[PDB]
Structure formats: C-alpha cells, structure tokens
Amino acid sequence: TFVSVAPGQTARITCGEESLGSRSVIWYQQRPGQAPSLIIYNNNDRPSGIPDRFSGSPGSTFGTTATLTITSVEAGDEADYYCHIWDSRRPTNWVFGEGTTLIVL
Amino acid sequence: VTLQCTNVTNNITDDMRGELKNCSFNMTTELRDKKQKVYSLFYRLDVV
Amino acid sequence: VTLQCTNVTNNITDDMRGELKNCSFNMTTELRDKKQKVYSLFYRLDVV
Amino acid sequence: QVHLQESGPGLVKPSETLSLTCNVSGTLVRDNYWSWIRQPLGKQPEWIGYVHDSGDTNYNPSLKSRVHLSLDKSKNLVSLRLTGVTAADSAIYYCATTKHGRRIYGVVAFKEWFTYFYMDVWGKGTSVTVSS
Amino acid sequence: GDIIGDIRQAHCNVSKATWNETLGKVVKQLRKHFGNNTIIRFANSSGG
Amino acid sequence: QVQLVQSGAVIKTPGSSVKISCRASGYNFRDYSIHWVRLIPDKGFEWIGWIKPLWGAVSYARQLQGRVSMTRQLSQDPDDPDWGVAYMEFSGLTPADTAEYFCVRRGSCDYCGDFPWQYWGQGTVVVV
Ligand SMILES: *[C@@H]1O[C@H](CO)[C@@H](O[C@@H]2O[C@H](CO)[C@@H](O[C@@H]3O[C@H](CO[C@H]4O[C@H](CO)[C@@H](O)[C@H](O)[C@@H]4O)[C@@H](O)[C@H](O[C@H]4O[C@H](CO)[C@@H](O)[C@H](O)[C@@H]4O[C@H]4O[C@H](CO)[C@@H](O)[C@H](O)[C@@H]4O)[C@@H]3O)[C@H](O)[C@H]2NC(C)=O)[C@H](O)[C@H]1NC(C)=O
Ligand SMILES: *[C@@H]1O[C@H](CO)[C@@H](O[C@@H]2O[C@H](CO)[C@@H](O[C@@H]3O[C@H](CO[C@H]4O[C@H](CO)[C@@H](O)[C@H](O)[C@@H]4O)[C@@H](O)[C@H](O[C@H]4O[C@H](CO)[C@@H](O)[C@H](O)[C@@H]4O)[C@@H]3O)[C@H](O)[C@H]2NC(C)=O)[C@H](O)[C@H]1NC(C)=O
Ligand SMILES: *[C@@H]1O[C@H](CO)[C@@H](O[C@@H]2O[C@H](CO)[C@@H](O[C@@H]3O[C@H](CO[C@H]4O[C@H](CO)[C@@H](O)[C@H](O)[C@@H]4O)[C@@H](O)[C@H](O[C@H]4O[C@H](CO)[C@@H](O)[C@H](O)[C@@H]4O)[C@@H]3O)[C@H](O)[C@H]2NC(C)=O)[C@H](O)[C@H]1NC(C)=O
Ligand SMILES: *[C@@H]1O[C@H](CO)[C@@H](O[C@@H]2O[C@H](CO)[C@@H](O[C@@H]3O[C@H](CO[C@H]4O[C@H](CO)[C@@H](O)[C@H](O)[C@@H]4O)[C@@H](O)[C@H](O[C@H]4O[C@H](CO)[C@@H](O)[C@H](O)[C@@H]4O)[C@@H]3O)[C@H](O)[C@H]2NC(C)=O)[C@H](O)[C@H]1NC(C)=O
Ligand SMILES: *[C@@H]1O[C@H](CO)[C@@H](O[C@@H]2O[C@H](CO)[C@@H](O[C@@H]3O[C@H](CO)[C@@H](O)[C@H](O)[C@@H]3O)[C@H](O)[C@H]2NC(C)=O)[C@H](O)[C@H]1NC(C)=O
Ligand SMILES: *[C@@H]1O[C@H](CO)[C@@H](O[C@@H]2O[C@H](CO)[C@@H](O)[C@H](O)[C@H]2NC(C)=O)[C@H](O)[C@H]1NC(C)=O
Ligand SMILES: *[C@@H]1O[C@H](CO)[C@@H](O[C@@H]2O[C@H](CO)[C@@H](O)[C@H](O)[C@H]2NC(C)=O)[C@H](O)[C@H]1NC(C)=O
Ligand SMILES: *[C@@H]1O[C@H](CO)[C@@H](O[C@@H]2O[C@H](CO)[C@@H](O)[C@H](O)[C@H]2NC(C)=O)[C@H](O)[C@H]1NC(C)=O
Ligand SMILES: *[C@@H]1O[C@H](CO)[C@@H](O)[C@H](O)[C@H]1NC(C)=O
Ligand SMILES: *[C@@H]1O[C@H](CO)[C@@H](O)[C@H](O)[C@H]1NC(C)=O
Ligand SMILES: *[C@@H]1O[C@H](CO)[C@@H](O)[C@H](O)[C@H]1NC(C)=O
Ligand SMILES: *[C@@H]1O[C@H](CO)[C@@H](O)[C@H](O)[C@H]1NC(C)=O
C-alpha cells in the first residue's frame, strides 16, 4: 500500500473491494500527526477549497475498484489517503478502507 | 433435489423481504457416477 | 459411466497402436439396488 | 468559523466508564449531524457512530452495547460515553461534523436509495489510552 | 447465475394524464347503462 | 350425479370467525361457479358471493365486504380430478347473523344463467 511517484507525474490510489453494486465513495486525506480532512464527497464531486487536480472514479460501474487519480503531484500530497466506500449491497462500512500512503520525491 | 438456500447478497432491511434466493444444490453431471455441486438463483415464488 | 480401460491382450509393439480397448465398467442390473461389474470391448475411435 | 475543542482523561484505568466531551465554535449542537471517529495507533480509523436529536442516533453495530452518544444543548456540547473499556480501545478519538445526502439509483418510490455520510471538518482530537 | 448491478424491482408505467383521461371516457359510457347521477367508483380485485 | 357436502353446525361467540367447507364431487370442479346463500328467518334468502374456482376469482356482496373471504382448493392429482372443496371465512359475527348457510351450484343446462342454482348443499346452521 505504498506508492512512490516523483512530482510532475500522475498518481493513482486504489482502495476498497471490487464494485458490487452502485457505489458512492468517500475519500479522505490524513495529515501526519493531525486530523484527517475530506477530498471527495461523492463519486466525483468535491467541496470548495481543494483544487481540481484531485479526481475520482464514477460509481456507475460494476466490477471495478474505487480509484483516486491525482494530476500534477506536488509536495503537499505527501500524506495518508483513506477510502470510505458505501456500496448498495454490502452494509454500512464503519471502518475505512486500506490506507495507502502517497510519498512524493 | 432438496435445495440449500440463503439470502442473496444484498442489503437486507427488515422492512423489505428477500425476493431472490440463492439455492445451491447437488445435480448429476453427464457422467452417471459423479455429482457436481452447482448453485443458481431462484425467486421466492418458486421455492417452499 | 466412467470406464476403466486397459490394453486388449495382444502383442503390443511400439510401432503399432492399440485398436481395441478393454473398458471394464459398472452398470445397473435389472434390480435397481444391485450394480454388476461388467466388461466389454471398445474401439479407440469410441473412447476419450 | 467552525472548530471543535475537546477534553479527555488520557490515561484511564481498565473496566471504567469512559467519557469524553467536545466543545463548539459558533455553530450549535442542535443543527448538525454529529459523528465520532476513533483512529487506532497507526491503523485506519473507525466510525464510532453518529448522533443527532430527533431519531438519528444509530450506532456502530460492532460495539452497539457499551457506547452511548448524547447531546447537551444547554452547554452547547456533544458527549461520548464508553462503559467497560478494554485494552483494545487504546486509541485517539475525534468529534466531527458530518453532512448527509441521498444517492438514488432507481425508483425513489420503491425505497431504492440510501443516505450516506461524510465528515467535512474534524476536531483536533485527543489520545485516550488505557494501561497501568 | 450472478446478477450484475443492483437488485431492483420490475415495474410498469402508464401516463397519469393519459390514463385518467381514458377513465374519463369509460365512466361516461358506463352511465349510459346505469343512468346518470350514479357515483361510479373502482377497486382492486378483492381476492383470488 | 352432483353432490355438495357441507360442514356441521357450530356454536360461536360475537367476534369470532366461522369457516364453512363445501366439498364438491361428481363433476369437473374447474368449470362451474360456486355461490353461497345465507337464509335468515324473517328476512328470506340473501346472497353472499360467488367463487369461480378455476383461478379463484371471487366477488362478494356490497353490504358484506370486509367480512367474508372465499378460498378454494383444487384436486392436484390425475387419478381423481373431479373433486374439490370451496370455503368461506365469514368474519366478525353478530347475534343478528345467526342463520343457515348454503353452498349452491348452477345447472349444466346451457339456456341457463349462473344464478338458477340446481344442486344445493345440505345446509349448515350457525348459532351465535
Ligand atoms: C417509470 O417511471 C419512474 C418514475 O420516474 C422511472 O423511475 C426513474 O428511474 C430512473 C432510473 O431508471 C431514475 O434515474 C436515476 O435518477 C437519479 C436521481 O437523479 C435525479 O435527481 C438529481 C438530484 O441531484 C439530479 O441531479 C438528476 O439530474 C436527476 O434529476 C440519478 O442520480 C441516477 O443516475 C445516476 O445513477 C445511475 C446508476 O448509478 C447511473 O447510471 C447514472 O449515470 C448516474 O450516475 C451518475 O451520477 C452519480 C450521482 O452521484 C455519480 O455519483 C456517478 O458517478 C455518475 O456520474 C438515475 O438516473 C429516476 O430517479 C426514477 N424516477 C424517480 C422519480 O425517482 C422509471 O424509470 C420509469 N420506467 C420506465 C421503463 O421508463
Ligand atoms: C398492490 O399495491 C398496493 C398499493 O401499494 C398495496 O397496498 C399497500 O400494502 C402495503 C403493505 O401492506 C401497505 O403498507 C402498510 O401501510 C400501513 C398503513 O400506513 C399508514 O399508517 C402508518 C402508521 O401505522 C403511517 O406511517 C403511514 O404513513 C400510513 O398513514 C402501515 O401501518 C404499514 O406499516 C406497518 O407494517 C410495516 C411492515 O410490518 C412496518 O415496517 C411498519 O413500521 C408498520 O408496522 C405498512 O406501511 C400500504 O398501505 C398499502 N397501500 C394502500 C392501502 O393504499 C398492495 O399490498 C399490493 N398488492 C399486494 C398483493 O401486495
Ligand atoms: C492411408 O494410407 C496411406 C498409405 O499407406 C498412409 O500414408 C502412410 O502413413 C505412414 C504413417 O505416417 C507413413 O509411414 C512413415 O513413413 C516415413 C517415411 O518412410 C521413409 O523413410 C524411412 C526412414 O525415415 C524409411 O525407413 C522408409 O523406407 C521410407 O523410405 C517414416 O519416416 C515413418 O517412420 C518413422 O515413424 C515411425 C512411427 O513413429 C517409426 O516407427 C519409425 O522408426 C520412423 O521413426 C513412417 O514409417 C507412410 O510413409 C505413408 N505412406 C506414404 C507417404 O505413401 C496414410 O497415413 C493413411 N491414412 C491415414 C489417415 O492414416
Ligand atoms: C443498508 O441497510 C442498512 C440497514 O437498514 C441501512 O441503515 C439504515 O439507514 C437508514 C437511512 O434512512 C436509517 O433510517 C433513519 O432512521 C432514523 C431513526 O432510526 C430509528 O429506527 C431504527 C430502526 O428502524 C432504530 O434502530 C433507531 O434507534 C431509531 O429508533 C430516522 O430518524 C431517519 O429519518 C431521517 O432521515 C430521513 C432520510 O430520508 C429523512 O427523510 C427524515 O426526515 C429524517 O431526517 C432515517 O429514516 C436507519 O436507521 C439505518 N439503520 C437501520 C438498522 O435500518 C443503510 O442505509 C443501507 N444502505 C447502504 C449501506 O447503502
Ligand atoms: C450464492 O451463494 C454462492 C455460495 O456462496 C455464491 O458464490 C460464491 O460467492 C463467494 C463470494 O463472492 C465467492 O468466493 C470468492 O471467490 C473468489 C474466487 O475464488 C475469491 O477470490 C474470494 O476471496 C472469495 O473466496 C465464490 O467463488 C462463489 N462461488 C462458489 C462456488 O462458492 C454466490 O455469489 C451467491 N449468489 C449471488 C448472486 O451472489
Ligand atoms: C451434496 O452432496 C454432498 C456430498 O455427499 C453432501 O455433503 C454431505 O452431506 C451429508 C448429509 O448431510 C453429511 O453427513 C456430510 O458431512 C456432507 N459432507 C460434506 C463434505 O459436505 C451435501 O450435503 C449435499 N447437499 C448440498 C446442498 O450440498
Ligand atoms: C465400480 O463400483 C465399485 C464399488 O463401489 C467401485 O469400487 C470402489 O471404488 C471406490 C472409488 O474409487 C474406492 O474408494 C473403493 O476402494 C472401491 N472398492 C472396491 C472393492 O474396489 C469401482 O471403483 C467402480 N468402478 C469400476 C471401474 O470398477
Ligand atoms: C414509454 O417509453 C417510450 C420510449 O422509452 C416513451 O416514448 C418517448 O417519449 C419521449 C417523451 O416525450 C419522447 O421524447 C421520445 O421521442 C419518445 N420515443 C418514442 C420511441 O416514442 C414514452 O413516452 C414512455 N411513456 C410513458 C408513459 O412513460
Ligand atoms: C434472509 O431471509 C429471511 C427470510 O425470512 C429473513 O428473515 C432474514 O432476515 C434474511 N437475512 C438473513 C441475514 O438471514
Ligand atoms: C497400451 O496402450 C497405450 C496407448 O498409448 C500404449 O502407450 C501402451 O504401450 C500399451 N501397452 C501397455 C502395456 O500399457
Ligand atoms: C381526470 O380527468 C377528469 C376529466 O375532466 C378531470 O376532471 C380530473 O381532474 C382528472 N384527475 C383526477 C380524477 O385525479
Ligand atoms: C343522462 O345524461 C345525458 C347527457 O348527454 C342525456 O342525454 C340522457 O338523456 C340522461 N339520461 C336520462 C335518463 O335522462
């Protein structure tokens, strides 16, 4: 669960199980030592304050995995990422997914 | 054959009821000796 | 039924191949409970 | 402005009724969905539950018995309560504000949707450990 | 076998503007056999 | 011949719910309707409702709706396909409902409405 990408390139964070039903993922960002924050609050929609460089995967597909694509990776992306999936067949996931660290050169 | 059926993988709420049952059973293959274990899906209006 | 076949009793040379297979199997008798063990002969173009 | 000031005993003896409060900033407790998150040491965080007045008090079914969330509208305070803590709940805690939202995937009249949750702003947190 | 996607109920649709207009027709011709000022109502097939 | 055998007499309390069998035999049960007639003293006969027993499509009276329910059970064996049984669950009784209950059947007559009932049941008296 470690992805090392030098800056200038792109990054793809993969979390969660396979797509069983129609999903609605929730993506977070954990600062080291601090409290987590929010990145994506739907399949693709994001709140204000973060740039457009963060993106997500649509949850209208069946058989894929909840990705997290980042274009123009900078030094501020050196943090811990957590997926929080809400599938329509499995019940409420009270724990977050596989936390992957995106360390940048 | 006497089936063995569980809930289909779905978000089972108490208000709704299971429309589709799982029903994994035994059935003879094309060879008369062997018996494969296969599964299917079945509606609730087809199993008792 | 899943057969069990050996070479027919013959002088097996490496150049020739077995044209007739032995193929002793199991098969129900006229009674539904008992199962006799019978044997036959079969050509190689009939068994896989 | 929105932020969350917390409290905590920190070092707790086992098998004790653990409690934890979390202050407000500007916004009142009566007008937001309130949720609580525990993050273990170096692990992925775990949703303790979510609380609100008028019904929305559904807990995490893993614990489901020793937890009790509660509101305090007079002090403008939210509160967590744990009864009989073992040595596995030694973690950090988080009070947080959450927004809801429905994602329809079919007919809305056949109850074919769900209401998810997401926590936009979080508290600063506290380390509540249990040892001797 | 498997069901891909979501478990949704099969349904049917009719247009409410069209269907209520058609019941406005058949409630007029029904009064030709049962007289006027007759409060015609419908129901949903009591049993069976 | 056509024979309709009913159930025996009962003694019920106000607020109970009777069930009156009517076992038909001697004809193909998947063809002919079965009605139910209640005979009250000082009021004459009174209809209740029919049951077309191919599928089980029923229709009751207007003043007895919500209180009557008629089911049927067919004969699912090819060794004896004529017999069958109709039912009637008369719910929410009253001391003003004590009467005699008859299950009838139309005649195989072809110039003949559904209502000129030929063969009758033996009669079941119900006391409340
Ligand atoms: C008989 O009549 C009924 C009555 O209308 C009709 O039911 C309708 O069924 C359709 C589907 O068959 C339902 O359509 C869904 O609608 C929801 C809600 O969208 C509406 O509301 C939002 C509010 O914000 C508006 O923005 C939007 O424009 C609509 O007005 C949609 O969300 C659904 O689409 C998503 O989900 C699908 C499956 O997941 C995807 O295939 C689709 O692409 C959408 O996914 C996208 O959006 C997601 C949103 O987060 C996003 O996360 C994804 O990544 C992706 O980008 C869907 O269209 C409709 O609601 C029903 N009507 C009512 C009143 O509820 C029957 O269809 C009709 N029968 C026949 C045979 O015609
Ligand atoms: C063909 O389609 C028709 C039309 O939909 C169906 O008729 C409906 O059947 C359902 C199921 O029986 C009915 O739903 C029930 O309604 C009851 C009355 O609702 C009123 O009262 C409640 C409070 O009691 C209010 O909340 C509500 O807003 C209404 O004002 C409810 O009491 C029932 O709920 C109870 O049972 C369920 C299940 O156990 C529990 O989850 C509940 O908590 C509660 O205990 C239930 O909701 C519906 O009313 C019918 N529609 C009507 C009468 O117009 C037919 O059923 C369908 N055909 C077939 C064969 O199914
Ligand atoms: C219908 O009928 C035709 C006519 O018979 C068949 O055609 C013959 O098929 C056989 C089998 O393939 C052929 O036999 C082979 O001939 C090869 C060529 O023979 C020359 O070379 C060898 C040395 O290499 C000399 O000794 C010989 O005198 C010839 O000068 C041989 O090389 C083959 O032998 C090899 O394989 C066998 C088996 O593995 C070993 O035992 C040998 O030691 C050696 O390794 C073999 O003998 C024959 O030539 C064909 N006839 C022709 C071409 O006229 C058809 O096959 C048949 N139809 C069907 C469907 O089978
Ligand atoms: C997969 O399945 C699970 C199990 O059902 C779903 O979890 C439920 O989600 C619904 C979301 O609507 C919750 O419903 C909410 O209940 C509140 C009160 O709950 C009472 O009842 C439950 C049992 O029914 C008790 O356990 C509990 O203690 C309470 O006594 C209501 O107040 C809520 O209403 C509010 O939200 C709706 C949303 O539309 C508004 O319309 C209302 O006006 C109001 O604001 C709401 O109805 C439910 O509690 C959850 N749990 C259970 C056990 O049912 C998942 O949602 C589902 N889907 C996934 C994971 O995608
Ligand atoms: C009806 O029930 C059957 C019986 O459980 C379901 O089939 C089985 O489902 C499980 C869970 O998806 C499968 O297990 C998985 O297998 C993959 C590949 O081997 C593995 O990588 C996973 O870790 C997991 O073990 C299993 O393969 C599958 N089949 C059998 C024969 O057991 C079935 O899914 C149910 N019906 C529906 C509609 O879901
Ligand atoms: C399908 O066949 C298998 C093979 O016989 C059955 O499995 C055995 O069933 C008997 C009777 O219940 C048990 O005593 C054995 O312990 C079972 N063995 C195993 C390895 O499972 C099985 O029950 C049959 N039915 C289904 C639905 O699978
Ligand atoms: C014919 O039936 C017999 C009787 O069951 C089979 O013999 C047994 O086969 C099983 C499965 O291979 C073995 O575990 C037993 O040890 C066998 N017992 C004996 C006494 O042989 C036999 O395999 C069947 N098939 C053939 C081709 O004979
Ligand atoms: C039933 O479905 C058909 C096709 O899915 C609908 O016909 C379409 O209606 C829309 C709305 O006016 C038009 O824009 C399309 O051109 C129509 N297509 C065709 C092929 O006719 C129809 O309206 C639907 N009816 C109901 C009651 O939902
Ligand atoms: C499975 O279906 C039965 C059918 O009555 C239901 O009672 C039960 O809640 C469903 N779910 C589970 C997990 O058994
Ligand atoms: C029997 O037939 C097979 C068929 O390939 C052959 O290889 C084998 O040499 C024959 N003889 C024996 C003794 O197995
Ligand atoms: C149905 O059509 C009639 C025809 O005039 C109209 O008056 C009525 O408002 C319509 N809608 C109903 C009965 O809901
Ligand atoms: C009922 O109303 C229609 C209106 O067109 C009228 O023609 C008819 O005569 C009326 N019926 C009677 C019995 O008057």
Query: Is residue A86 within 8 Å of A59, Cβ to Cβ?
Result: no
Which atom of ligand 11 is closest in space to residue E20's alpha carbon? 1
CA A79 – CA A31 distance, rounded (Å) = 5
Q: What sections of F37-96 are H helices per DSSP?
A: none
Query: Is residue A30 within 8 Å of A99, Cβ to Cβ?
Result: yes
Q: Please, which chains are in contact with E (at least 3 CB pairs closer than 8 A)?
A: A, B, D, F
**Domains assigned to chain A:** 1-104 (2.60.40.10)
Query: After which residues is the backbone of chain A broken at C–N > 2.5 Å?
Result: none
| Contact assignment for E48 to F60 by CB distance below 8 Å | no
**Domains assigned to chain D:** 1-132 (2.60.40.10)
Query: Is residue A7 within 8 Å of A74, Cβ to Cβ?
Result: yes
Give the residue from chain D lying closest to A49, CA to CA.
D120
The method of structure determination was cryo-EM
CA F36 – CA D25 distance, rounded (Å) = 75
**Which residues touch D55 (CB under 8 Å, ≥6 apart)?**
none
- List CB contacts (< 8 A) between E45 and chain F: 57
Count the alpha carbons within 13 Å of A67 in the hemisphere toward its beta carbon: 12
Angstrom resolution of this structure: 3.5
Query: Is residue B38 within 8 Å of B24, Cβ to Cβ?
Result: yes
Structure tokens at F71: 């089911």
CA D11 – CA A91 distance, rounded (Å) = 34
| Contact assignment for D110 to E8 by CB distance below 8 Å | yes
Beta bridge mates, F34? F51, F105
Inform me whether the C-beta atom of residue A21 falls under 8 Å from chain E C-beta atoms.
yes
Inform me whether the C-beta atom of residue D111 falls under 8 Å from chain B C-beta atoms.
yes
Closest listed residue to residue C22, CA positions, set C10, C37, C38, C5: C5
CA A26 – CA D96 distance, rounded (Å) = 15
